[PDB]
DNA sequence: AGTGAAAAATCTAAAGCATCACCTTGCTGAACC
DNA sequence: GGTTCAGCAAGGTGATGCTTTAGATTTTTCAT
């Protein structure tokens, strides 16, 4: 008997849109500090990491820790029945594999409840180890979306570069070199449009942008994304929904081989 | 009826008197006579009763020439199984329905091949009708077979009431034998069989023709065989008519002598006698007859064929182009082919004599010579088999030629006559006859007749020894149900698994690459003393007991195979090995004791009482089945069948009456219930086509009848028998050579090519039995037999794959075997020198023994039993492992090609060429089919004789290159510097036109419009006579336009200057255009994307598969493959994260 | 001779763009009485009405009854360059073979005649079982959509449920069974987003979700759709458009075997 | 090298929006007039000119008539990374041998650089024949391409005709005649409907229309389409508004002169 | 070096579906009387 | 303190490019 409440019900679709695309399968875990989703992909390259406290959520109790293994390409196509101003509530059994939602309406109006049987899987886990994490920079979500759309055309790689004048992305491809540059402009009260950038050394790294696409498409959760980067480690990137939690989305980079001999 | 009556008797003495005349006088003298079988037709020879019957004639030829023909009468055979208990009142029906139509009704009680609860010996009987000739049959057929149809839908209608429950004229269940011919009939139940000798015996007028095989003699006579080629007069760049043209010259052989008839009407000069041997074996003794015209050239033809009498008359394409040319010279000159020599066309446009098996070479090139397609043409497989070549010559310059001067002409001539001979006797005659032996087929049809009837008219031998009922052939089953509740569309078994895995330049020379895995390394290391111990024991059939040097060729193992160890990867030669039995697919039948009449369900397996846990009666077997069907439900089709009832509906009859439900054949009603339902879900289920492919394990039970078992095993082991004898009288030739005994080595050289005939039939026949299965509507043909054949085929190959896939680098996964390279360090066979005097050396082959403990170990099986002797009551136990998997020896190179998309697998596609330079085989190309552009012809045979050059990679694609490179400068150019006059020739394209151009209707194509064009060009006068196939050409200054409807003919630049320039500027849209001169309408741009996708597809893309820069850099890659090579060879690449991020654990969800 | 004016050109644009799907060939028919359109769909499974009185066009004066047999894919293919603003004439003469109109404007500018050719076949004129029915429910055509739409993914059969709560559609399927509920609205006096419920006895049947959406891409035609149901009749779908006239759909509902039922 | 400075860049994301099916490859001229675009198509029957001048941009700044060729479909997919408000700066260089595009964000924080080698192709100029026309038509291009995208798919060919009470279009086809007249606007002065029409001589011409609504579908560029037209003559068709736009198409007339029958 | 006919690969037109820019509308904030 | 008009977020909607299904055409394969 596991409840889940969620009064603004739109950012439950903003992360479930986000994960179709180049997820298929992940693996829900529940426990009495919240839920999490720490899953790989099944191409085996970047991995997600949801993590929801129970502080946004208004209805909500759980006692034992377990997990579920959703399928991501047939959950969101039955989440976008509600409205974006609904709000849900899950249902979960303890014996049973059937999860059920509630759609009801805030008008009082048009109430839905659903089921859906389930599987158990066999996936991997990757727990992430405490570093420095430096170079971190905060962005608008949708200007670094947009670009990043923007950049799949030209490239199908990135490079990206923290240092002392702005933040380099450069894309590298067959037609011509894309690259953009972010200003300081801390003079700013205004958090959205003020960008903060800090760091400790000029770190050059590069990824797949292919990838990248599929990454960006968590657009409206938060406003502002914090991304972070170091050196031969896969890039970390937090869209924050502050109400109760937030989406760490890690992504593997492309290095050299090595010293050739 | 007696006006058809009189005029088939009248037909009956005409062949009589006109083989009376030719040298086969009848069997009319009471007494005993000896012969060996030459042919077998129908006829209809009468009795002394003069009653109406149909009688068969038999030709026997002597070893001295005394030749002799004998009819013996013979009724034909059907049997009708109708309702049971009450046959004795629909049999006196039928004979009371017509007065002596029918000669004689009997009923004999058979066996079922397929009927349930066999043990207890359960019996199903029909009733034999058998009438006096073979059209009353004929005709009783077209009278009977629609209400047959008709009431087999009433006795479906009652099997599906009588299901339920379990849940006159029409008393008649079911009929069979309305395919079988007369003579195949005949031979089937009387056992006759051609090429044997027979004895016959005749006393009296009132009895009937004894015969009795004498199959003591082993030895055969030679035929008189008279192999003869025609040349014709012609009007330049146009295939000959008969109607006008004329022969200049006749080449005909006669059992060693040669004779040359010319026509000196048109050839200037006499031609003397000479002589023309290319080889010491092929004498070449000619002599020349010369006639003023071509009436006397063609009487003479015939006169000397009535005096010298030849049985067996021997052409190369005879059914297409020369004996209606030479059937038409005749009727020209007030004379007949069926009036001297009896040489008529049959329904089927071939020609067959009642006396003189017309034999045509190039079907057996087609069918059973193994010779690559594309390459049947006469010099070819005289080149391939004979291993000489034929002098060529052109037939535009041999009209000029006729004139100028006739020796070397002729010696063209005789050369196609003695290369036609030849080829004849040394390879295909006794070949054709150990074919004769064994199939009940007269020789004209069992070289004409396809590879499936062939292993019918075999099995149906081997089903009238066993005395069964012949199954009919396998109609097409309208709207079936599958047991969810859905109709098909399509319903397929194992879809032909073909997969080339690399493509490439490989060769015997080339250093190839190899990864090798040392795992397997170190199972060979400790396997392979045992590998060859049971090599020698199986393979040999001798015990290792006999052997004493063993050691010394187990230490070369051990040193070659340690080296092996050395470095995993490695470059040097390889050789090229073909991974495979000559057709595993009959041992797959054998060891798995499969046959197409013992697979059922679990429905009616249960129904049988003999079912037993643990035993042999029930095995099961695994196979994947493939359905295209309708996603429309069950109840729906009922719903839709009550809502198609009781309504109008237009009738096809023309001013029909008002039809109804019942009268209505199923194939409209299957239309108008297919367009139906494709209306119903093409709105309410948002599909019509579902293909569901799944997993299927099939019950096969015991023998009922082995029918299908046995006749493969004897086959097989006969074969090898044939094979063991074969080799000694080749061992005893072998001393016999130097031993100097003229007469005794002639006739030991007539034993050993008899035996090496009947070798290499068996094999053919053994190879024949997968192509037979392999079809659908074969009257023997199962569904999940094939299944089971091709998927047992496919995990046994695929496990060859995966062991093969480390010790080298193996290229091409095929539905024959695997096509691979092997490293030379690898040893590759091995002689042994043997104390036994049977043989003082064995060959044994290396990877033969590791693909025999592979099939071996592998597979496992203890289902195999030996009935010795059933006295003793003796059961040994032992296992048939006999997949031998024969490495066809070390060849010289292999060429693949690549396909136009990312990713997608070859069909059947490569070519693989033997160690002298000689092309082994090809499969899949565009040399396949003689359509298509001739442009392509000069291009793809210039690269295929280009890759046996040069040692490195690098050299081989840049002889490629120099050859892609010439042929595209010449396209590059606009083809300028050469004459245009063979240019029209060679960029045309030629496509047939079947129909006419109202049949399609409404809809147009690119031979729609081009015949369009062609009624413009002259008129309807063109269209009433259209039956010639169409040549075109692709216009290009109307752009925009698609392509079908962008082709112009060669016809109109023919015609007189005005009007096709006029006519011209009509078609090309466009009447401010200066120029005619053929330079800027011709399409270049769909030229060169034709020559870029063979380019691309043969050289280029495997190219840059075997990481080499392009050969052709001026034809780029297609953008996938362009984007995948340049994210390859860049040493910036993707790291995974099972390395940069560790292990924390594993789990799954158990159950509690 | 037939003459009709339309002051507005939305419905009349819109009813081609509804129809145009379940119905290929159709047989229209002019008279005194207005305009009739008895139709089957290709599959013989549900039945069209469009019908509209004389009284709801401006002006509409005609001869005498006519049944003309053009199809209906082309009309709407003709017909569909006309907005939603554009005011709508069409005028017939007996003699002549051919059928004109104009959609003009307001300001006489934009103008557009076109003459229709009258190709010939007559369809049988089944007369329509008239009948009570049980329950009827008046609810909006946007929610009706959404709700279509929405059960469209989930699943194929609906079952439809007409009880004294309201009205209750479910879906069952692979990817979960779903169940909406829709209550009475008492406490809401405007009819422009609440529902109308009609009871006499609870029913419930199963119908086709393709069938479903045909019939509801109707959607702009009115705000109101009124779903009704009898007894075993075909489900009756009605568009009450304006004073001018109807659109009522009917579709057979599917028998179940009650064999493994 | 032309960095010209833009007050709004949408107009050059738009054109090559739209015009990436028409060309395939084309080459940019640059002179001391502007922008001078005079490209023939992929199927050789038109030849399309555009008009940008310089004086209607901020600044000019080039060393001499300078002709790049620049694949016209390739750098497509890369200028929509630019914003309907995005802006194109200022620089200067005289010797670059690899053109780059500069993109700035309205808020002045983001700038980019979008780079592409030089890479030429010599394309034959073609003379234009100019005389003036009989006929011009000035129409809002909004129901001009509302009824040229609603009539090019009942009718592959048009007579166009011109008078003075009202120009005609009619196209036949397989499911019916149609035809569109317009009349003038005299006591008409603004700009979102008028139809003005000068007038000489009625001309008739024969027109395919698939060639029309797709091949040339450029129009939010400017507001008004004006054709201009002649007796023997093939279609002028402008898209114009003051200096910030000015392109024309060349359809000629695919008629032959009776020599089918 | 022929022929004819059927199963399957290939080519082409039309419908499904996710996405993007734009039209219209409800909620709300600051200047005004 | 009521008003009111503009600003802005947001749903609905026409238009669009990629994808997927369906019917006609050639191509291989098998019988001859
Ligand atoms: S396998 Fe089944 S049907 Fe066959 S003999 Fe055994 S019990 Fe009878
Ligand atoms: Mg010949
Ligand atoms: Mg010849």
Same mark, same amino acid.
């Given at each position: ?261 | ?1046 082709? $112009? =003919?060669? #016809?109109?630049? @023919?015609?007189?200057?005005? !009007? ?6 009509? +078609? %090309? ?31 280029? $893309? =495997?190219? #840059?598969?075997? @990481?080499?820069?392009?050969? !052709? ?6 953008? +996938? %493959? ?31």
């Amino acid at each position: 008997m596991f409840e889940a409440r969620l009064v603004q019900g739109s950012i439950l679709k903003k992360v479930l849109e986000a994960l179709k695309d180049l997820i298929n399968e992940a693996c829900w875990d529940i426990s009495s500090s919240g839920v999490n989703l720490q899953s790989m992909d099944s191409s085996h390259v970047s991995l997600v990491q949801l993590t929801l406290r129970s502080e946004g959520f208004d209805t909500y109790r759980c006692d034992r820790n377990l997990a579920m293994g959703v399928n991501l390409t047939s959950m969101s196509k039955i989440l976008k029945c509600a409205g974006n101003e609904d709000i849900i509530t899950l249902r979960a059994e303890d014996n049973a594999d059937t999860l059920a939602l509630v759609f009801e309406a805030p008008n009082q109006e048009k109430v839905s409840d659903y089921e859906m049987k389930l599987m158990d899987l066999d996936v991997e886990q990757l727990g992430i180890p405490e570093q420095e994490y430096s170079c971190v920079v905060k962005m608008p979500s949708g200007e670094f979306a947009r670009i990043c759309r923007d950049l799949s055309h030209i490239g199908d790689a990135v490079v990206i570069s923290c240092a002392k004048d702005g933040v380099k992305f450069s894309a590298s491809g067959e037609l011509g070199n894309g690259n953009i540059k972010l200003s300081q402009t801390s003079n700013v009260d205004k958090e959205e449009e003020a960008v903060t950038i800090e760091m400790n050394e000029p770190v050059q790294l590069t990824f797949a942008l292919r990838y990248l696409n599929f990454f960006t498409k968590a657009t409206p959760l938060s406003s502002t994304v914090t991304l972070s980067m170091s050196a031969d480690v896969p890039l970390v990137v937090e869209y924050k929904i502050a109400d109760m939690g937030h989406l760490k989305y890690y992504l593997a980079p492309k290095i050299e081989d090595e010293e050739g001999s | 009826s007696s006006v058809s009556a009189l005029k088939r008797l009248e037909r009956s003495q005409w062949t009589d008197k006109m083989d009376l005349r030719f040298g086969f006088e009848r069997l009319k003298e009471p007494g005993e006579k000896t012969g060996w079988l030459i042919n077998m037709h129908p006829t209809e020879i009468l009795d002394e009763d003069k009653r109406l019957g149909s009688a068969v004639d038999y030709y026997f030829i002597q070893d001295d020439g005394s030749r002799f023909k004998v009819a013996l009468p013979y009724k034909p055979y059907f049997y009708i199984a109708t309702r049971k208990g009450c046959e004795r009142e629909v049999s006196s029906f039928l004979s009371k329905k017509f007065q002596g139509k029918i000669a004689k009704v009997e009923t004999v009680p058979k066996e079922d091949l397929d009927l349930p609860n066999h043990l207890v010996g359960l019996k199903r009987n029909y009733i034999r009708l058998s009438f006096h000739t073979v059209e009353d049959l004929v005709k009783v057929r077209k009278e009977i077979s629609p209400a047959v149809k008709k009431n087999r839908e009433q006795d479906h209608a009652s099997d599906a009431y009588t299901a339920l429950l379990s849940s006159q004229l029409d008393n008649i269940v079911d009929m069979r034998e309305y395919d079988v011919p007369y003579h195949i009939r005949l031979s089937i139940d009387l056992k006759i069989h051609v090429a044997h000798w027979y004895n016959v015996r005749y006393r009296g007028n009132a009895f009937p023709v004894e015969i009795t095989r004498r199959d003591d003699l082993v030895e055969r006579p030679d035929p008189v065989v008279l192999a003869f080629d025609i040349e014709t007069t012609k009007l330049p760049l146009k295939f000959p008519d008969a109607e006008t043209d004329q022969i200049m010259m006749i080449s005909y052989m006669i059992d060693g002598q040669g004779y040359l008839i010319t026509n000196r009407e048109i050839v200037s000069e006499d031609i003397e006698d000479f002589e023309f041997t290319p080889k010491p074996e092929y004498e070449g003794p000619f002599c020349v007859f010369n006639e003023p015209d071509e009436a006397h050239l063609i009487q003479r033809w015939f006169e000397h064929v009535q005096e010298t009498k030849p049985t067996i008359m021997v052409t190369y394409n005879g059914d297409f182009f020369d004996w209606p040319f030479v059937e038409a010279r005749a009727a020209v000159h007030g004379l007949s082919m069926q009036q001297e020599i009896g040489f008529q066309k049959d329904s089927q446009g071939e020609y067959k004599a009642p006396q003189c098996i017309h034999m045509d070479c190039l079907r057996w090139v087609k069918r059973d010579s193994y010779l690559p397609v594309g390459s049947h043409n006469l010099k070819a497989a005289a080149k391939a088999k004979l291993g000489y070549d034929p002098v060529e010559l052109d037939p535009e310059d041999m009209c000029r030629m006729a004139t100028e001067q006739p020796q070397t002409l002729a010696t063209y001539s005789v050369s196609d006559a003695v290369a036609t001979y030849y080829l004849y006797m040394k390879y295909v005659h006794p070949f054709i006859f150990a074919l004769c032996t064994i199939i009940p087929m007269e020789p004209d049809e069992v070289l004409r007749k396809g590879s499936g009837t062939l292993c019918e008219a075999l099995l149906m031998v081997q089903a009238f020894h066993a005395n069964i009922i012949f199954p009919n052939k396998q109609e097409q089953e309208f709207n079936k149900l599958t047991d969810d509740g859905h109709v098909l569309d399509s319903e397929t078994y194992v879809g032909g698994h073909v997969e080339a895995l690399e493509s490439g330049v490989f060769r015997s020379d080339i250093p190839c690459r190899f990864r090798m895995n040392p795992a397997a390394f170190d199972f060979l290391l400790q396997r392979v003393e045992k590998t060859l111990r049971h090599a020698l024991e199986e393979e040999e059939k001798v015990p290792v007991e006999q052997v004493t040097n063993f050691e010394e060729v187990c230490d070369e193992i051990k040193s070659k195979l340690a080296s092996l160890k050395d470095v995993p990867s490695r470059i040097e030669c390889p050789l090229i090995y073909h991974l495979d039995v000559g057709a595993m697919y009959p041992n797959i039948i054998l060891t798995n004791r499969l046959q197409p009449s013992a697979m059922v369900d679990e429905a009616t397996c249960a129904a049988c009482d003999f079912n037993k846990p643990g035993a042999n009666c029930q095995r099961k077997m695994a196979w994947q089945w493939r359905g295209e069907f309708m996603p429309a439900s069950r109840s729906e089709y009922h719903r839709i069948q009550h809502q198609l009832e009781s309504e109008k509906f237009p009738p096809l009859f023309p001013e029909g009456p008002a039809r109804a439900f019942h009268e209505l054949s199923r194939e409209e009603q299957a239309k108008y219930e297919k367009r139906r339902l494709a209306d119903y879900c093409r709105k309410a289920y948002k599909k019509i086509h579902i293909t569901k492919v799944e997993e299927r394990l099939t019950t096969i039970c015991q023998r009922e009848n082995s029918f299908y078992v046995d006749t493969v095993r004897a086959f097989r082991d006969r074969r090898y028998e044939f094979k063991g004898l074969h080799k000694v009288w080749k061992k005893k030739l072998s001393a016999a050579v130097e031993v100097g005994d003229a007469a005794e080595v002639k006739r030991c050289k007539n034993m050993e090519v008899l035996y090496d005939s009947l070798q290499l039939a068996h094999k053919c026949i053994l190879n024949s039995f997968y192509g037979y299965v392999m079809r659908k509507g074969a009257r023997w043909y199962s569904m999940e037999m094939a299944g089971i054949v091709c998927f047992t085929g496919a995990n046994i190959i695929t496990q060859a794959r995966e062991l093969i896939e480390q010790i080298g680098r193996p290229l091409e996964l095929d539905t024959d075997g695997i096509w691979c390279v092997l490293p030379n360090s690898f040893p590759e066979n091995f002689v042994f020198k043997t104390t036994n005097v049977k043989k003082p050396k064995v060959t044994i082959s290396y990877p033969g023994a590791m693909l025999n403990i592979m099939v071996k170990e592998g597979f496992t099986n203890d289902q195999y039993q030996e009935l010795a002797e059933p006295s003793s009551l003796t059961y040994v136990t032992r296992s048939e492992n006999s997949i031998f998997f024969e490495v066809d020896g070390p060849y010289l190179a292999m060429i693949l090609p690549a396909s136009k998309e990312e990713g997608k697998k070859l069909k059947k596609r490569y070519a693989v060429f033997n160690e002298d330079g000689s092309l082994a085989e090809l499969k899949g190309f565009e040399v396949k089919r003689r359509g298509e552009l001739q442009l392509i012809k000069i291009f793809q045979s210039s690269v295929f004789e280009a890759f046996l050059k040069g040692s490195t990679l690098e050299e081989v694609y840049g002889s490629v290159a120099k050859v892609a490179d010439y042929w595209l400068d010449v396209l590059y150019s606009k083809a300028a510097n050469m004459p245009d006059s063979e240019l029209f020739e060679l960029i045309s394209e030629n496509r047939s036109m079947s129909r006419k151009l109202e049949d399609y209707g409404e809809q147009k194509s690119t031979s729609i419009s081009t015949a369009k064009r062609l009624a413009e060009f002259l008129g309807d006068q063109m269209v009433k006579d259209a039956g010639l196939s169409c040549r075109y050409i692709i216009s290009r200054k109307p752009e925009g336009s698609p392509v079908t409807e962008r082709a $112009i =003919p060669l #016809a109109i630049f @023919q015609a007189e200057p005005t !009007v096709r320039k006029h006519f011209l500027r009509k +078609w %090309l849209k466009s009447s401010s255009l200066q120029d005619f001169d053929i330079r800027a309408i011709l399409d270049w741009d769909y030229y060169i994307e034709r020559l870029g996708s063979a380019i691309q597809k043969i050289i280029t $893309i =495997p190219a #840059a598969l075997q @990481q080499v820069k392009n050969p !052709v850099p001026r034809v780029k890659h297609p953008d +996938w %493959l362009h984007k995948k090579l340049l994210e390859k060879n860049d040493v910036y690449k993707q790291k995974k994260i099972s390395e940069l991020f560790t292990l924390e654990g594993r789990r799954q969800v158990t159950m509690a």
